[PDB]
Each structure stands twice: as structure tokens, then as C-alpha cells.
Amino acid sequence: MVGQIAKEMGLRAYIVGGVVRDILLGKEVWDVDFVVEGNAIELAKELARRHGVNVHPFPEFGTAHLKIGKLKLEFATARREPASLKEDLIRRDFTINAMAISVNLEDYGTLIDYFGGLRDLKDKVIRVLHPVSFIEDPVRILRALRFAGRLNFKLSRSTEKLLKQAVNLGLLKEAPRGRLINEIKLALREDRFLEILELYRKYRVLEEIIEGFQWNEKVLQKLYALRKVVDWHALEFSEERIDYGWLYLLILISNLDYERGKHFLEEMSAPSWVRETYKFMKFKLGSLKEELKKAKENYEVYRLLKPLHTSVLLLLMLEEELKEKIKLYLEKLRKVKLPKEKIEELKKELGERIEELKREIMNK
Ligand SMILES: Nc1ncnc2c1ncn2[C@@H]1O[C@H](COP(=O)(O)OP(=O)(O)OP(=O)(O)O)[C@@H](O)[C@H]1O
Ligand SMILES: [Mg+2]
């Protein structure tokens, strides 16, 4: 694979970063990151050569990206931004991300841990490499929590102190906006994203990001309830799955004004249906809940929930009194079908009579 060419080219290549951590944690990963002492670009192009695949070079970044099957390989030259592996490693964020495993033939299968990344790994501890790490790259403030959210890891004393410092220093607000938005977009893709929100509330990061944002108990409660509803729905219908991460985000921004909220969602590069759910949540949701509680017949609820998005209904299952109604619509009302002969007798305006018969049968 690599070590052959690394030996033939006299270079030294290493599997580096999150991939190594995932391997140690027994995680399946098809995305592989390499750091090389040598010329990594030529090594990558020669790998792509021998394998006969296509290689995208990046002279500016001094890196190369090549894909074999659905497996993606990124090769990078060791750099301090020559530079030894250690110097390339210490510039990264955390200890568990700071390790490497050699693919070179002599040392193959050797985990190289300078900073005790394995020590901090087994202790479930997120730890920065250097004391200025948060000031250096503010994104890490969020990142740590995310990892701490994902793996259920605790922040070390030093790390927590530095993090709280950098947060109180407000460096988060003066951080590059794009990278922050990216980190947030990556955070919501987590299944542990709710716990990440717990850490967010704990260290108050969102208050330093979004305009006029604060925390109250009702939002948190509706977030737990949201987790319940999401778990139940994901349990019942496996083919109806959507992205639930945005729903929590819509819960958080619920109390905020429409203008800045819309601007924020457009700033997040959010999907259509999400922002549509937001606009529908602001204005039309109140009268929706009103007329929903005012519905005597099941068919009326069917008519009301028919044009609605599924996410809107899932969001509507948060109400206790509306639970059985939503569950009824999902598991019964919308599954109703008809025979042939009846349609033929109706044909001797069509959809009207169809909805009429729907009204007839769905009330049983
Ligand atoms: N903001 C950052 N500061 C320093 N190093 C970083 C930063 N972001 C990523 N890295 C380094 O890049 C490597 C992989 O990048 P990435 O941000 O995808 O993290 P990851 O471990 O791959 O997370 P995931 O497995 O969830 O994708 C990490 O091991 C880390 O050392
Ligand atoms: Mg990765």
C-alpha cells in the first residue's frame, strides 16, 4: 500500500489524527489522513499511479487527494503551519488527535504518542497540546465540547480553565465566522448533539455567537421531549427518516425574532424545508395548534396535516394533548386506500368525492 513506496522513495508515511483515534476505539473509517516526512505529493501521485486511480494535487496546500473505491485518501507533507512528524502533530488540537501510526515497513503497527494521547484516551479526557491552543484557534473551544459530547469525555483541569478563559475573553465572537458555522453544522450531525448542546449551555458558547440569545428552562425541556419524539419516530418508521439535527436548532431560535433568525438560518446554509418550517413556525403555527385542538373529526386532522411537512408534525408531537392525534395520523389515517368498482360507479369532481368517502370511512 504505502510503506512499500515510502521505502522505495526513502520517505516516511504515517496514518495521522482522528483516524488513529477511531482505530484505537475500534471504529470503522473509510476516510484516511496521512502525514509524511518527505515529499507527500509525489508519494501520493505514485500511489495513484500504481493503483491506476485519479489524483488531485494541491501544490498550494502541499497536499494531495486521491480516492480508491469509496475509500478516500488525503496525503499531506509534514509541516509546522522541513518539519518532523512531531512538529506537524503538536500544532493540532487535542491529544487523542495528536497521535500517529506508522505504515512504514520496519515500524509498521507502531502508535507514536508524544503527548500521552492514549493516556488521555483511556481516561475519557479532552486535552489541548499547548496552553494557548484556544486563543490560537478559537474553533477548538466548540470542538472540544463536541468530542466531549460525542465520546462522553471530560475536559481536563487545564483544558477547562483555558476554555473558560478564552470564552470569557470573548474570543469566540471575534473568531472567523465561517469556521464557526462549519463546526456548528458538523455538531448537529452528531447523535450525541444534544449532549453537545448541554456542554454548550454549560460553557455558554451560543450566547457568544447568536444575536440576543439566552437560555431558559422551557427550551431545554422541549429539547428533551424532542429527543423523546425523535427516538420514538426513528424507532417506528425507518424509511421516513430525516435530519433531526436542524429541529433542535429551530427549537433554540424559537424565542428569537424572525428577521435575525432567518438571517441566521440563511447564514447556516440550511436546507429549504428547514427554513420553510421556521417561517411556518413563526406565524401560522399558533392558529394551526388552535384549529388542531378544535378538530372534532379525524378526517379534519387528516386534511390539516396533509399539506404539512413531516418535520412539522414531529415538532407538533411535543404537545401531550396532541400526541395521540399525531400518532393516529401517522399509524392509521394516512394509510387509507380504496377499491376499484366504487371508483367506477363514481365515474358512471372526482377528487372531491374521493375526499368525501375519506371523510366517511376515516371517522370510524
Ligand atoms: N481546529 C483544529 N485545530 C487543530 N487541529 C485540527 C483542527 N481541526 C482538525 N484538526 C486535526 O485534523 C484531524 C482530523 O480533522 P477533523 O477536523 O476531521 O477531526 P476528526 O478527528 O477527523 O473528526 P471526525 O472523525 O469526527 O471527522 C484531527 O485529528 C486534528 O488533529
Ligand atoms: Mg475525519
UniProtKB/Swiss-Prot annotation:
Mg(2+) binds at D31, D33. ATP binds at residues 18-21, 92-93, 97, 137-146, 150, 179. tRNA nucleotidyltransferase involved in the synthesis of the tRNA CCA terminus. Adds the terminal adenosine residue to tRNA. Can incorporate CMP into tRNA ending with C74C75 (tRNACC), with very weak efficiency. Adopts a seahorse-like shape and consists of four domains: head, neck, body, and tail. Belongs to the tRNA nucleotidyltransferase/poly(A) polymerase family. This is A-adding tRNA nucleotidyltransferase. The chain holds residues 443 to 823 of 824 of the full protein.
